[PDB]
Structure 1
């Protein structure tokens, strides 16, 4: 325990000393030079702040990782974060976009990605979705089922417009637990049929291994399956594929003290780098072709490390358990923040760990065990992914009005919010390349929330 506390304050000092994102000023956590205590006095909490410089650094990591293969194309999985200002930053950094719904395709087109910079994935692509995608000449539509393929044939014919497709294959219980992709056994006939379709153009095969995968071997195994079948089909069908699409899954470090962690038992430890992901993928593709295009679809890695959730300590209490004779059994120091699981979904629903610190007292020892609660009704709306069990460490002097920061809060955190208890979804602030801040998403207002309803005011 004392060791756990000691280790946590070693990590705290690494944040403000040797982290490319963070500094401190006046004892306050700073992000790209921006004082986060002061920022949280200018915008109402809770809100997220994103760093454009850190997104750029992440994208460079990915792109540098694939230097051994010139013919690589990188599509940001916009399901990770599709706030328009974030997408615009990713476009400016020079990569492309991946989309999982009609409205995702549309927003990518709106913000400036060309059709030939967009890949459309999904297990459900209704005819209206497919018609929209085909009419906008998307780079790829990644076909997930034979039923969807029938619609692509019929709609491409209606539009007299070529649909460019990959066939998604499940490289692997995966009949019972994997809803996506075709069985490998079905790729050959599926491809044979596409070749014969006048307006469907087979570009390659697709797979996606998973999310936050903390080892290289699954990527290597699955890529080899895809590569072996691509090679075989080239011979059997007498074709040359343009590409292979190996998906996403590059992990992000959510716990940084790798010496104390096992990525195979706790995948908050990232286990591998973008370079290890590239090495595994490229090695398997080059056993087939060095010239073929490799498409990748990273999501999490582009934005995960590039935002902080800022939330104000809004209440406090001590709760005491007594035996049946009025004698203290134990005290619990509860701190309440104005963000709960409706603001940070994965902390609750997917047992996700984020570093928690007192951004107003970043240079103070984090030396008191506390429990950290949200504002929702749910008895379960408190943060259970603690430093030790369900307990967090904050400075003993923590006060109502301090600002708490959750780090590594940029992946899958904005669109997954709700208005449970009619608490609004949060504003979002962006730090640009010059270190200046601006609001890029408003907090939901009272009006915004009732406007969807149809009713007579009393």
Structure 2
């Protein structure tokens, strides 16, 4: 039944407002950490993202508590996930470290107050200028992704007379890695690469690195890949006569985007989280401890830190009914279109990666969501509507939904800011933060008109 789908969705809605650590209701409205989101969306122009420092902290706690059995664990937030400076500041103040994915990511992490010894710099294209900047800033780790890059690390560390601290990335063939994995070295190359680093005067080998993937719905991939890295670490300690400082096992802890696990198969629909942080930690720690209990384990969670910790707020800005008629002029069906002021230039993964986010009427959060609608964005593009619905391409909202109501997309905190575009010269969005005291502030402005053209060089008028 669609009645059953509708019943289930309204049970989920009730659980948001009565059963979720993040949310409440007041005045008929969805609240996030006590902040009425209808009211918030009248103080700031839509569309915008609102982050929760309290929920970031809760997510970091899940991660760190998961690793309680291994004291020497170091946690580096994968800042490609979200690098708005106030988001990075909340993460730094919560007591963890940072992983960076470009020269400018390294620089902004340093600027917001991560120390060099709290930063890992990873990449497949680390040009001489990138490596010089990283080495000059005494980073905790720079990964070694290829033999070509390693030659630049040797030459530049020598030039600067500064030790480059490295981890060698090895991507295991776990049953095709050569064809589908661009990153890292082959297992077969690890020994000679490590031997060569040991002989370099200004490069310090700290350990091996891997990263399995993103939104991983099973523990086995982590266990099998970690075992490969652990076995090679153990073997190289013996062969080379060294003791590694660490092992870096990467990220990939999933986040629930659908919550009714009893109705989902995570291996078929990875919007269902197939595993928890505790499952990830159990797999990793168990494998590492077969080698050493004292070695440092570095992890690089991205999505899990911020994914659940933001909402996208977008105003219903237009509506229409489209009707299909048969050849005799009789109605075949009606479609109720609701247009919000955010499209895929604002929420890119909803279009490009078939990503599901819960959608509710934040202005009518206590009302039955009892009408099937299609949800469109504002871009001049027939494809700019939200295809990942509750049932096919259809969403559920109260039949009473009105232009002016605020729609919320939940779990909108990972990979949603830097992926925005200025397609159609709609601006990239502002971003608001709810701090630990429940107070709000703007942490990113909406792009202005000046910002659309300030990059261009042209004869003025």
Q: Same fold (TM over 0.5)?
A: yes
Secondary structure of 1:269's aligned partner: coil
Instruction: For residue 432 of structure 2, give the secondary structure of its aligned residue in structure 1.
Output: strand
Counterpart in the other structure of 2:416: 413
Q: Distance in 2 between matches of 1:8 and 1:190?
A: 54
Q: What SS does the aligned partner of 1:170 have?
A: coil
Deviations 1:94-135 (A, max 9, x none): 000000000000000000000000000011000000000000
Q: CA deviation at 1:418?
A: 0.2
Moved over 3 A (4+): none
> In the TM superposition, what is the alpha-carbon distance from 1:325 to its structure 2 partner?
2.1
Deviations 1:326-348 (A, max 9, x none): 11111110000000000000000
Aligned-pair distance for 1:442?
Answer: 0.2
SS at 1:294's partner residue? strand
What SS does structure 1 have at the residue aligned with 2:170?
strand
1:57 equivalenced with 2:58 (yes/no): yes
Q: Distance in 2 between matches of 1:178 and 1:273?
A: 25
CA distance in 1, matches of 2:255, 2:13: 18
Question: Using the alignment, how far apart are the partners of 1:377 and 1:399 within structure 2?
Answer: 22
Q: Can you list the C-alpha shifts for 1:317-374, whole angstroms capped at 9, x where unaligned?
A: 0001112221111111000000000000000000000000000000000010000000
Q: CA RMSD in A?
A: 0.5
Deviation for aligned residue 1:457: 2.0
Secondary structure of residue in 2 paired with 1:44: coil
Structure 1 position 274, deviation (Å): 0.5
What is the match of residue 88 of structure 1?
89
Written as runs of structure 1 = structure 2, the 5 A alignment for 1:368-447 is: 368-447=371-450
Distance 2:276 2:186 in 1: 29
Question: Helix, strand or coil: the match of 2:308?
Answer: helix
The residue matched to 1:303 in structure 2 has which SS? helix
| 1:153 match | 154
Q: In structure 1, what is the equivalent of residue 203 of structure 2?
A: 200
Please give the alpha-carbon distance, in whole angstroms, between the structure 1 residues aligned to 2:37 and 2:222. Answer: 38
Shift of 1:377: 1.1
Matched, 1:290 2:293: yes
Count of residues in Structure 1 that have an aligned counterpart in Structure 2: 458
Gaps of 5+ in 1: none
Partners in 1 of 2:409 and 2:337 — Cα distance? 17
Compute the displacement of 1:271 (Å). Answer: 1.3
CA deviation string 1:9-37 (max 9, x = no partner): 00000000010000000110000000000
Q: Which residue of 2 aligns with 1:142?
A: 143
- CA deviation vs aligned residue, 1:117-164 (integer Å, no higher than 9, x gap): 000001100000000000000000011000000000000000010000
Q: For 1:182, what is the secondary structure of its paired residue?
A: coil
3-state SS in 2 of match to 1:156: helix
- CA distance, structure 2, for counterparts of residue 446 and residue 282 of structure 1: 51
Superposed counterparts of 1:272-283, under 5 Å: 272-283=275-286
Measured in 2, the distance between the counterparts of 1:289 and 1:72 equals 13
Give the Cα separation in 2 of the matches to 1:343 and 1:92.
28
| 1:203-282 equivalence runs, <5 A | 203-282=206-285
Shifted more, 323-332 versus 163-172: the winner is 323-332
TM-score by length of 2: 0.99
